Amino acid sequence: QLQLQESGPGLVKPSETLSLTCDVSGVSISSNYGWGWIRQPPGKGLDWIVTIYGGTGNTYYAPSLEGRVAISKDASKNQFSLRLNSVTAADTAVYYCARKITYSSGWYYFDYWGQGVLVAVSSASTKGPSVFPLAPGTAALGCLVKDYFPEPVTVSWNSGSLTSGVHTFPAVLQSSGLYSLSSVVTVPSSSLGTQTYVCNVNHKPSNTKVDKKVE
């Protein structure tokens, strides 16, 4: 009974407003905890945006343009949301919601964090991926997830059953403005035929659920 789940669109056009909601369970949004939003741009570190305190209703904002940032509690749905309008390309990041609790000093710290939702800011539209099999004492096998937008993509290899020797590589950004992904798995030599392999690649933004079987 304590869980924070971020929710919101993974892609927002520029100059629009991104809205993200944090589902809180096991604890009331009205108890005097701190509810904050922290983002992480690709490659950079964490960056605090805003905090709102249940009970007091106090809000605290990091330096930004007047009225860009907005935060709001909701006791009926037991959630707190963030609104960031006039969004530019520098707003693509991974956004986390977290809880603040005091300690002996009387000041708050983010003790429990959320899974985090990543939002991209561009004029590019959503595109579904293509999946291509990758086959050549130890052997290798993989799937190529090509030409999709935006991130992320989930790859598992026999519906989660096989996991040792699996590597899903960080997605690359091509010249075309699309992403290309590869997920491999190291396999014993005498297994190319004895055991079948089916990469499970799903892309939520485009609703692409494909189980691709190799060789």
Binding site: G34, G36, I38, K44, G45, L46, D47, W48, T51, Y53, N58, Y60, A62, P63, Y96, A98, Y103, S104, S105, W107, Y108, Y109, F110, D111, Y112, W113, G114, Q115, G116, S130, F132, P133, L134, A135, P136, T138, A139, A140, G142, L144, K146, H167, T168, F169, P170, A171, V172, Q174, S180, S182, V184, T186
Partner: protein
């Protein structure tokens, strides 16, 4: 604003010896500081609060110390699972995070397992062809990947992607993708990728014809 800056940017130490992560603040902030750990691909976890207190469920090898503008996070005796980025954080009721510090646990030199993947026939139907070169479980991280098309070097049409350091064996894996067109791929025979690594006395080459 209270700018929080961390040092060093990167670390590389073996298990057993301690790592000292530093943290400087603009103005004095008393002990109102926390330390967070962010394992690759995960959300941050609270390690220290009030500058010198270990949070619940944290191994005793993590320590916090410092007061005013200078603080220190100590990891007495690194473990393989300690690979992460560490964040210093100031809190009045405005919060300010540091820029982070990458901790890498240095490992025995391990040579990569090189694999090359020819394109699928379904892929040559589209007109764009990708050939993937795979490096598996190598250390150190720095590595060279050369793409050669029928002997000649092909530089300008490939992209690399290196995973995070594994939290078990502390190795890396690299994936290079060489992209060509249908008419360009079907106009040459042998395709190879040559890798150079510290764990290799000689560069190895994996290739295929057609």
């Amino acid at each position: 604003e209270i700018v929080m800056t961390q040092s060093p940017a990167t670390l590389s130490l073996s298990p057993g010896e301690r790592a000292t992560l530093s943290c400087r603040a603009s103005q004095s902030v008393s002990s109102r500081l926390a330390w967070y750990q962010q394992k690759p691909g995960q959300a941050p976890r609270l390690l220290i609060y009030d500058a010198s207190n270990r949070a619940t469920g944290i191994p005793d090898r993590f320590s916090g110390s410092g007061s005013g503008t200078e603080f220190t996070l100590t990891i007495s005796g690194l473990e393989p699972e300690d690979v992460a980025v560490y964040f210093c954080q100031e809190d009045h009721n405005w919060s300010t995070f540091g820029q982070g510090t990458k901790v890498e646990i240095k490992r025995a030199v391990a040579a990569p397992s090189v694999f090359i993947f020819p394109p699928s026939e379904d892929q040559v139907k589209s007109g764009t062809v990708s050939v993937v070169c795979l490096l598996n479980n190598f250390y150190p991280r720095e590595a060279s990947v050369k793409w050669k098309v029928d002997g000649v070097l092909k530089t300008g049409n490939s992209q690399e992607s290196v995973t995070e350091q594994d939290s078990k064996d502390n190795t890396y894996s690299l994936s290079s993708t060489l992209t060509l067109s249908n008419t360009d791929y079907q106009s040459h025979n042998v395709y190879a990728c040559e890798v150079t690594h510290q764990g290799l006395s000689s560069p190895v080459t994996k290739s295929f014809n057609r």
